[PDB]
């Protein structure tokens, strides 16, 4: 009666085998799901307020090293001299600074002026750039209320207002300067629910932070996540300190592996990016900027001292990042080095990529950096690299660098296949995916590396042009409404279809009290209306 044994098992478990193989694929994706980028925001000296502005600036080889600001109450004359040994003096007086640090919109988030002035500029600027990045992702910030998304950030303390204190703004300084309050406040104002974490690994603090987010996004405690870092300095005490060891470049320009590599240069930086799982982002219809394949973080540990890193740790972290990403040195073709410009770290990094990349290369890999274009931005500097590569990968063009006289002699460039990317080059699609490497070596000892892959191929879709269409805009203030209207007018001066931009502004924006609507059927019609629109009603409902 048990003769039913021959045919049965095959049909019985033809599904069991594929089920259990699918489970294996599930473990593979769980440990190694590529993560997706959908949001973007950056703020850098030289007037950089949008990522495309930065990309264009790098494209035109424009330096951004500025002069030391004086609005912070600095006794500049007491710090500038040719005496590098004089107490409390810096042999450098030129450096990139974000001059818009003091500017802020307190009313947008409903912030009283007393706490606003008492509040650390880092936090307000965090909130602004976070909102900008979230909008850039085309996601309604209001809809994020009650969601499980989390926030991760990286920043070190700076003691803004740590000196003389007035007896009026008391009660806000502790919340003003505490680092965790940054993420706490951004989540509170956004009404989120995911984990809120602030970290610190010196200049690498951004790069590690987003890496952490990846784990969370892989683990499943949040749908999307926010990452990035900001560094703005209120006291020049760093420069003079480094001026005591003469680590800075007297001209304030970091020569990335150049012949004249003789110092470093500091700058302020702002960067925020939205991270999301590839499958979830694909389902949600959000556009894909670029995909991460893996990450690695490790501490150098023992070394010749405390500040000097060991190249073997760099080799280990590069290999670990490549293995976790499942990539090989052949596939990648461009790596964003740290580009500190120090006479010590630069040769070590150079031979590190020599030993880890300059092998069995059928094509000579290209090396570039951004610090020759702007400088070092401390914690933000790391994430700054991610800002430009994704733009460079977007435009299919390799951006050049600056101050390239000839490569520093401390590197046997014959050993590897690397060469410095001193000239802008085309980086087009060819059917083979394009990959870019990012790295950061914090002075605290920890080092991090990131791997980026180009976004997949998405077919363009053609749509009919509607005869007539409304254009709507909402904001919290009338002047903000006018500025927005002028901005869409300026954008409309370019070549865009009216229907698509109308759909975008109606589907990728929130709704605010200040409202304005203009009906138009032609680009000229809408431009004229926007530049002439002056009647707006912030009414109350009945």
């Amino acid at each position, epitope marked *: 009666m*048990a003769s*039913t044994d021959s*045919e*049965k098992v095959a*049909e*019985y*478990l*033809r599904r069991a085998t594929l089920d259990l193989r699918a*489970a294996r694929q599930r473990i593979r994706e769980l440990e190694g799901e590529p993560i997706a980028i959908v949001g973007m925001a950056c703020r850098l000296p030289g007037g950089v307020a949008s990522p495309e502005d930065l990309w264009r600036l790098v494209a035109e080889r424009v330096d951004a090293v500025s002069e030391f600001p004086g609005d912070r109450g600095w006794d500049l004359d007491s710090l500038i001299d040719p005496d590098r040994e004089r107490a409390g003096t810096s042999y450098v007086g030129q450096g990139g600074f974000l001059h818009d640090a003091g500017e802020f919109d307190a009313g947008f988030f409903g912030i009283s002026p007393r706490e606003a002035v008492a509040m650390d500029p880092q936090q307000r600027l965090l909130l602004e750039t976070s909102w900008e990045a979230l909008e850039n992702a085309g996601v309604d910030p209001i809809a994020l209320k009650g969601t499980d998304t989390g926030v991760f950030s990286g920043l070190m303390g700076q003691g803004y207002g740590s000196g003389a204190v007035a007896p009026e703004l008391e009660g806000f300084v502790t919340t003003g300067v505490a680092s965790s309050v940054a993420s706490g406040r951004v989540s509170y104002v956004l009404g989120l629910e995911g984990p809120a974490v602030t970290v610190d690994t010196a200049c690498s603090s951004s790069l590690v932070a987003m890496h952490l987010a990846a784990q969370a996004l892989r683990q499943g405690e949040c749908s999307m996540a926010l990452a990035g870092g900001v560094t703005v300095m209120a006291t020049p005490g760093s420069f003079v300190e480094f001026s005591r060891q003469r680590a800075l470049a007297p001209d304030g320009r970091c020569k990335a592996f150049a012949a004249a590599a003789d110092g470093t240069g500091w700058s302020e930086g702002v960067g925020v990016v939205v991270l999301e799982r590839l499958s979830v982002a694909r389902e949600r219809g959000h556009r894909i900027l670029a995909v991460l394949r893996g990450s690695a973080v490790n501490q150098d540990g023992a070394s010749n001292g405390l500040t000097a890193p060991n190249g073997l740790s760099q080799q280990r972290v590069i290999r670990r990042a490549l293995a976790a990403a499942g990539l090989a040195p052949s596939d990648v073709d461009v790596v964003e080095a740290h580009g500190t410009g120090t006479t010590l770290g630069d040769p070590i990094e150079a031979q590190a990529l020599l030993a880890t990349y300059g092998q069995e290369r059928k094509q000579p890999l290209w090396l570039g950096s951004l610090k020759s274009n702007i400088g070092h931005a401390q914690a933000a500097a790391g994430v700054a690299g991610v800002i430009k590569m994704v733009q460079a990968l977007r435009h299919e063009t390799l951006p050049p660098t600056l101050h390239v006289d000839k490569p520093t002699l401390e590197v046997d460039w014959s050993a590897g296949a690397i060469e410095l990317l001193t000239e802008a080059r085309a980086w087009p699609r060819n059917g083979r995916p394009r990959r870019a490497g990012v790295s950061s070596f914090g002075v605290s000892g920890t080092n991090a590396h990131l791997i980026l892959e180009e976004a997949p191929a998405e077919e363009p879709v053609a749509a009919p042009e509607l005869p007539v269409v409304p254009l709507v805009v909402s904001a919290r203030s009338t002047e903000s409404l006018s500025g927005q209207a002028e901005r869409l007018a300026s954008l409309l001066e370019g070549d865009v279809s009216l229907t698509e931009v109308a759909g975008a502004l109606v589907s990728r924006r929130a709704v605010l009290d200040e409202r304005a609507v203009v009906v138009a059927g032609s680009r000229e019609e809408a431009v004229t209306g926007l530049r002439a629109l002056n009647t707006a009603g912030s009414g109350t409902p009945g």
Partner: antibody, heavy 118, light 114 residues
């Protein structure tokens, strides 16, 4: 993905014929053995029939009760199985399901109801 | 001659705690190859049937991991750990040693406990 669609059910007066067709997608339909099972309303499920694949000759086997009126056939070109009511009766009113796998049933369609009345 | 499989007729249960449903047989289900030809099917109220467990040991895809099963000889048991609201339905511990099968038996219904 492995997806099943069922169609052909409906209300027909007693003593007629009907065709119910179930189409498969996302996998090799011809490599499995289809089956059909009906469930009476307010009652349990009842096995009806099953047809093997070409590897085993694609023989069709039916319960004795349903013998003589119902036939099951499969088309690999369209990956669709047809089951044929004949001499339809009221007592045969049931919701019918097409499943993949001869003995084990790993999948079910949306299910179709059969109404028989005058 | 035909093996007869039985089980508790109904097991009303509250959510949040594990439950267990047994299933007996009139013959040993082990084969010379060394496998217990017993499967478990679940039908939701007014929905298609669903397959959860085959060979009483390993679980199919899609099924929540809170499900499990075990047994040997002619005795077997399906164990749930977290009773849920949608977990109510009709279960069938149906054998495959003898083919074909005419029906699935009465089955075991599960309802919330009050």
């Amino acid at each position: 993905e492995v997806q099943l669609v069922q169609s052909g059910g409906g209300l027909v007066q007693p003593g007629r014929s009907l065709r119910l067709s179930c189409t498969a997608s996302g996998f090799t339909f011809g490599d499995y053995a289809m089956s059909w099972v009906r469930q009476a309303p307010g009652k349990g499920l009842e096995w009806v029939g099953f047809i093997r694949s070409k590897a085993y000759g694609g023989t069709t086997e039916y319960a004795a009760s349903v013998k003589g009126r119902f036939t099951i056939s499969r088309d690999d070109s369209k990956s669709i199985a047809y089951l044929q009511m004949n001499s339809l009766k009221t007592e045969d009113t049931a919701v019918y399901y097409c499943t993949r796998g001869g003995t084990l049933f790993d999948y079910w369609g949306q299910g179709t109801l059969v109404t028989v009345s005058s | 001659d035909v093996v007869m499989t039985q089980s508790p007729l109904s097991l009303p249960v509250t959510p949040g705690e594990p439950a267990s449903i047994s299933c007996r047989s009139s013959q040993s289900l082990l084969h010379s190859n060394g496998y217990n030809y017993l499967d478990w099917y679940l039908q939701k109220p007014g929905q298609s049937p669903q397959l959860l467990i085959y060979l009483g040991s390993n679980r199919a895809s899609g099924v929540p991991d809170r499900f499990s099963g075990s047994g040997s000889g002619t005795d077997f048991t399906l164990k749930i750990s977290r009773v849920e609201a949608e977990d109510v339905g009709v279960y069938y511990c149906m054998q495959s040693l003898q083919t074909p099968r005419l029906t699935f038996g009465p089955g075991t219904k599960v309802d919330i406990k009050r």
